[PDB]
Design an enzyme around this catalytic site. Structure first.
Site, short mmCIF file in Angstrom:
data_model
loop_
_atom_site.label_atom_id
_atom_site.label_comp_id
_atom_site.label_asym_id
_atom_site.label_seq_id
_atom_site.Cartn_x
_atom_site.Cartn_y
_atom_site.Cartn_z
N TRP A 195 39.75 37.70 37.23
CA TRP A 195 40.72 36.91 36.68
C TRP A 195 40.41 35.61 35.70
CZ3 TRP A 195 45.55 34.40 38.78
CH2 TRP A 195 46.74 34.11 37.96
N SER A 200 37.43 42.32 40.94
CA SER A 200 38.73 41.98 41.03
C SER A 200 39.50 42.77 39.95
CB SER A 200 38.69 40.58 40.99
OG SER A 200 40.12 40.21 41.13
N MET A 201 40.04 41.86 39.05
CA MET A 201 40.87 42.67 37.98
C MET A 201 39.92 43.42 37.05
SD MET A 201 41.91 39.96 34.67
CE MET A 201 42.06 41.29 33.49
N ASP A 243 40.00 38.93 52.29
CA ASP A 243 40.43 38.46 51.08
C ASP A 243 42.03 38.29 50.86
OD1 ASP A 243 40.91 38.63 48.41
OD2 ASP A 243 39.43 40.07 47.76
N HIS A 256 38.11 36.75 48.86
CA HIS A 256 37.85 37.28 47.59
C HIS A 256 36.57 36.77 46.70
CE1 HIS A 256 39.38 39.12 44.23
NE2 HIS A 256 39.40 38.08 43.53
NA NA Z 1 39.85 37.08 40.38
#
Ligand code: NA
Ligand SMILES: [Cl-]
Ligand SMILES: [Cl-]
Ligand SMILES: [Cl-]
Ligand SMILES: [Cl-]
Ligand code: NA
Ligand code: NA
Lengths: 271, 271, 271
Positions: B28, B94-95, B222, B251
């Site tokens: 992100w 992640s994203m 996470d 994370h």
């Molecule tokens: Na992220």
């Protein structure tokens, strides 16, 4: 985005949304990111928002020459013409009030629907023989002296009076950090030359050329650009100008009074 | 390096080394620099590594439009085309797990040798009617609310739960400072638009279209992207997928478990 | 401004003022901004000043290949030819002493009026069998080991012995913050490769090729590049070279001894 100015300086800009254009001119030792919240706010509500990094600041090139209001005003003309903008509302903060004003003075208002002056140096910031009430030139000579020893610490120390943190305004460390980070992108030369530019440029001739609806907004707690001798006078000098004074607001009121500003800008655009 | 996307958005990327290509898609509020240690690790060991700043992030342009997964996925297709990559291993964090999944769904896997999903939002992050176990859309609404007030302090506060510093992970001030510095490069608009995108985009159809060897790695501590409803399920929904769970990892495990990750990526490539 | 090197690497530079040219080559984990005060000082006094970000640093591209002194020297050659500079005074700091020396060694001095070596790694930095007084190579191996775990904290920790803060020098938080911000722009790969380069490259052959007026300046409290085995020897090996030793000055003396340096550069130019 970028365009290339007359002398070859590449200028960075953002052009967001669709609809009637609103073009923002940032303050001193800042860049276009100072406007991100106003841009998002207006572009989410049916406006096109444009903001550029002044030559020597942010992501723009850093020329040795042309760091003066006539050139800043012509950089704006070149941007407006590059995008072929029409019915533009010009919004200038602090020293950026000066280049939007000088743009109107140099190029006329054919492309301009309205003007907003925020905590602006207009109509004159420093002392002149007929304006002993302005800021003594000694003050600006001292900015330069300090910048030419250690601009990074000058910037850091400037956050407190800029945001009015020393008078009980609350601004996060994150904002203070982002402010320092963006300021460090700028040229040392441009940072110093801008002092010269805003200290000594007389925009009183410009005030009489402003023939479009105008809103002047200023904080009366502004420690950097004194309301009494700038915003207050600009509002009387520009025919038909509206004045709003944010009570006890600091110079950096686009952060401390963001929501209030967003709403006043939208109100002006809808007038 | 840069290429220009279909809508004119200039995208920054790095392309290091020679050999079979590994293409990295960042999370992100980050940029291509998040991958620097994996890139150096693999490129010193006979691989070519490529990583881009997603539109609106790092050194890329900041478009108002196109901040969605179909466009992110087509941005990746254009990068792959620009460099003419073949037998690429896609790696998303992640994203960024979502845009490499969507690239395969939109464009097929003829250019793809393999897929790695790291702490990834796949197959679905936020709630749907058949997915009440997802993250409630009010949590994302609150991210957006805080971003639209003060994104800088939001990013700064995000460091602790991102890296698990609030749960006994040790990450230097230097890394926290670098994370915040890179995050401030991004567009406010793209930062908030990405919340909408990763909150509401369903990649379950995409999982069925993944027909290449796949490795899913997730930290089960996470705090940002819950292992149980993302990585655990992605590994079951992709045929032949392998799953590795980093015990108590946060994370931001590309930092806290860097060496383990490097070795796992190398072992996957040498399968 | 930018130019594109033979291999496609875009290199950022600034070109300020007019008159006889002075081209500045920065040290390690810095960029052209380290020179901003010297550039403004000289360009305000009738000189043209040019400074580039070394490939992989600051605002330049980050190539995997060519992170070696021959290539650095050839980048400088292209810049000089690109701008058609004549009677240029080359000024190198720290590792940048080596690429201006190597430029002269590789390309000759037809375009060069003079040379200034500041806190420079010349004529050689690391140990060799005939140079056991050099810095042991395991010191540099350990730099590399730390860089490949956490470069951000390495940089942060480096500020103290760089500026001699741990040893009686006074440098603001602003300067330390700016140093770290600029350093984080650089490539991890370039940062590590430069260690290999400055650790192992022998510039003793280059010294015998320097046939122009030369000023060596070095602090004698330099904790990074020790005066006795570098600057002291460089001034003996270059025919006709002048040596100035700044008493108790650290490695980062363009900051701590800025005015003194400015005045000595000006004096050398006017000799
Ligand atoms: Na992220
Ligand atoms: Cl004073
Ligand atoms: Cl009020
Ligand atoms: Cl190994
Ligand atoms: Cl001295
Ligand atoms: Na200002
Ligand atoms: Na150095």
């Amino acid at each position: 985005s970028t365009f290339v100015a007359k002398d070859g300086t590449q200028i960075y800009f953002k052009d967001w949304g669709s609809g009637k254009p609103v073009l923002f001119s940032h303050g001193w030792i800042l860049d276009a990111d100072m406007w991100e919240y106003q841009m998002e706010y207006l572009s989410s509500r049916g406006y096109r928002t444009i903001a550029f990094d002044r030559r020597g600041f942010g992501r723009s090139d850093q020329p040795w020459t042309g760091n003066d209001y006539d050139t800043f005003a012509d950089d704006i003309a070149q941007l407006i013409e590059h995008l072929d903008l029409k019915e533009v509302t010009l919004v200038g903060f602090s020293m950026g009030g000066g280049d939007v004003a000088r743009y109107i003075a140099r190029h006329g208002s054919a492309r301009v629907a309205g003007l907003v002056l925020l905590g602006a140096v207009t109509p004159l910031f420093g002392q002149k023989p007929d304006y002993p009430q302005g800021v003594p030139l000694d003050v600006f000579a001292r900015f330069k002296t300090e910048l030419l020893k250690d601009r990074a610490q000058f910037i850091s120390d400037f956050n407190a009076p800029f945001y009015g943190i020393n008078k009980g305004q609350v601004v996060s460390q994150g904002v203070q950090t982002q402010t320092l980070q963006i300021a460090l992108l700028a040229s040392l030369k441009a940072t110093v030359d801008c002092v010269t530019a805003f200290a000594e440029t007389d925009f009183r001739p410009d005030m009489a050329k402003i023939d479009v609806p105008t809103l002047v907004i200023h904080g009366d707690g502004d420690q950097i650009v004194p309301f009494e001798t700038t915003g207050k006078v600009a509002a009387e000098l520009i025919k038909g100008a509206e004045l709003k004074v944010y009570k006890d607001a600091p110079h950096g009121f686009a952060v401390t009074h963001a929501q209030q500003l967003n709403e006043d800008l939208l109100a002006f655009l809808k007038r």
